[PDB]
Design a protein around this ligand. Structure first.
Ligand SMILES: Cc1ncc(COP(=O)(O)O)c(CNc2conc2O)c1O
Ligand SMILES: Cc1ncc(COP(=O)(O)O)c(CNc2conc2O)c1O
Lengths: 382, 380
């Protein structure tokens, strides 16, 4: 629980707590919150975010694939967990003994699983319906009835839920959203019995139309304090608190003379006498090469990145001479300046979701709770 | 280990072995090969690559920072390890105890280290000289002599080597290169005595001028079978064998009707009756969103990724009806077709170095040695 390089990410768990608690109050009392923590909680720390979400009101968790669910179980999480993606029928028994719910969307998957499992633990399934996303899910009434039939036949197979996912809930215009919502209601009629859990809402849908969430919402991106899209920021019911920040420190500082070049390709040349700082973070840490024309914060001021970004380090133009060890902020606030994940996303020309997920296993995560350090997670630590 | 998702990377250790052994045969008997395995061996697997490189002829290893060095030690590697980047003066004792060599380039660093460490383990330092990279290293005579003086005075500090790094060794034009080389020889004259290890060459430099590498080369990108740059591919002394491949399997297949949308934002619309496959790999796996429109391999044919790439999945247009479980190759060979890391780098508008480093911890690595499966490493 220690690290030996001056580069780290900070995760504010009080922000995550507040983001989830505010949702708990916004939603009808009889609507459960499933916190989605796949991809190591969007790069924030799976078990740490999960524990906090459960404290704030969430009652279930969601991950992308089986390995992620098993990892949470090994770390002591006992809350129900749903695997949103595909799994192998041969792993049905493992999921059952570990009390992990599985997503199902095709009958031939059940055919195979039935021939491999015979109890005694029940397997809870969530039927995925494709209402316009085109990713995973059933689309035909025949296939839907067949899946339900195979589940009812098996004494250890249980249909615990049914859901769909929206492709454009974060768009101001709600035409396609309305289409998917209506399709969902229509497909719901294909079921002979309504399962106990009906869900469809992600962050954008739950925050914009809390009354149209049925009995469970799958809360992701907004839990981390990130807007589903900048376009709906002014439509959010409550203010979101950004939980992720990234920092480093100067490990070298030198003054260059006019003509001297910097980094690979010698693409940058100091025109006048200027101070250059080197920080221990590079593209192998998720600070991609495409960010070469971006900037960082040092001493409350913007400092542009100079030359090409390296695998483990990069250089920046300092306003003047600063001492080694001076804190640098890549994502976060310093004085009156701020660099948000959305800013980084803009220059990488991607969405905020992708940024924290790309900050590699190499960067330690320091967790804060009650304005104090709770723990440090170093993926390659002793 | 084992994994429960049909997406995995394969690392051919035989390719790594060959790439290193071929260099061993081009170098002089007294020149050491220091295998560069920082960033988890450029995303290939730190201990697996290190072990293989050592068997092939390398005698030392290099990493980016202390934690990476400590990880190798904890995994059984006992060969010498040099930390190429910065470290804290307070960690000198830890480095000494684990027999890890440290890079040094500031006198104030040594002053602090001296005050905090008094033995009993010796600490081997490698002096970094900035000859034009502008990253790390000393630049003037005064600083250099002060550093040497501080090392000589301490009973447990030892100057094991000194080095520099080239910024344009991969470029056809060798003007800036020759400039850095000449500066290095000049700066070497500031030392009262030549340390036991003098090094300066990386993959490009070692492969193009094997006779001007001094006594140790730092072999990186080429060890993995990737050319330092497209410009020097024809200048390489021997053919490099690419070691990394990435695969997945179709988990869903469906036929869409004209007018139907695919993925977030519904940016894709089927113009005719099409077969769409879903594979369990997405941007949280390092298969970045920018790879939309790129082509993957399925049933020996190229198929485009359609619609936006999601966090854990993406969709491809199939050449027709294929069964669930069909193998999809994102990087590698399938029949007569091949997709190289260079091709992925081209689409992403970056360099090959960045690609395997970005394939995340979430993707298991399967290792092959002697044409047999040797081990499975699943970070989670
Ligand atoms: C099935 C499912 N439900 C809920 C969520 C949470 O979405 P949210 O972070 O907007 O609240 C996701 C993540 N959605 C994804 C975002 O990018 N790729 C994904 O698969 C998901 O895949
Ligand atoms: C000091 C040092 N020596 C040797 C190497 C190996 O270089 P090579 O993979 O071209 O043989 C690197 C990696 N240099 C980096 C490559 O990309 N960013 C870097 O910082 C390095 O930093």
């Amino acid at each position: 629980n220690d690290f030996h390089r001056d580069t780290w990410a900070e995760v504010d768990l009080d922000a995550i707590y507040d983001n989830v608690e505010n949702l708990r109050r916004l939603l009808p009392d009889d609507t459960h919150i499933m916190a989605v923590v796949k991809a190591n909680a969007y790069g924030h720390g799976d078990v740490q975010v999960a524990r906090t979400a459960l404290e704030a009101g969430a009652s279930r968790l969601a991950v992308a694939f089986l390995d992620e669910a098993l990892a949470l179980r090994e770390k002591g999480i006992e809350a129900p967990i749903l695997v949103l993606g595909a799994s192998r029928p041969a792993d049905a028994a493992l999921a059952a003994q570990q009390r992990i719910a599985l997503t199902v969307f095709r009958s031939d998957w059940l055919e195979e699983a039935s021939a491999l499992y015979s109890g005694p633990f029940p397997i809870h399934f969530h039927l995925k319906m494709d209402t316009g996303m085109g990713r995973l899910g059933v689309k035909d009434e025949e296939e839907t009835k067949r899946i339900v039939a195979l589940i009812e036949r098996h004494p250890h197979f249980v249909l615990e839920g049914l859901y769909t996912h929206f492709a454009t809930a974060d768009e101001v215009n709600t035409d396609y959203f309305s289409y998917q919502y209506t399709r969902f209601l229509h497909m719901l009629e294909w079921l002979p019995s309504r399962p106990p859990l009906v869900h469809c809402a992600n962050s954008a849908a739950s925050l914009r139309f809390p009354d149209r969430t049925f009995n469970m919402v799958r809360f992701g991106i907004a839990m981390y304090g990130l807007a589903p899209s900048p376009g709906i920021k002014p439509l959010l019911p409550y203010p979101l608190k950004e939980a992720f920040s990234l920092h480093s420190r100067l490990v070298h500082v030198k003054k260059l003379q006019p003509g001297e070049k910097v980094s690979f390709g010698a693409t940058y040349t100091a025109q006048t006498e200027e101070w250059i700082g080197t920080i221990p973070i590079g593209y192998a840490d998720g600070w991609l090469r495409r960010l070469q024309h971006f900037h960082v914060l040092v001493d409350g001021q913007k400092a542009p990145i100079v030359g090409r970004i390296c695998m483990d380090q990069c250089m920046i133009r300092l306003p003047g001479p600063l001492p080694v060890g001076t804190k640098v902020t890549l994502i976060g606030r310093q004085g009156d300046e701020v660099i948000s994940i959305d800013d980084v996303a803009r220059h990488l020309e991607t969405i905020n979701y992708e940024v924290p997920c790309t900050i590699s296993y190499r960067v330690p995560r320091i967790f804060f709770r009650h304005k104090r350090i709770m723990e440090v997670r170093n993926a390659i630590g002793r």
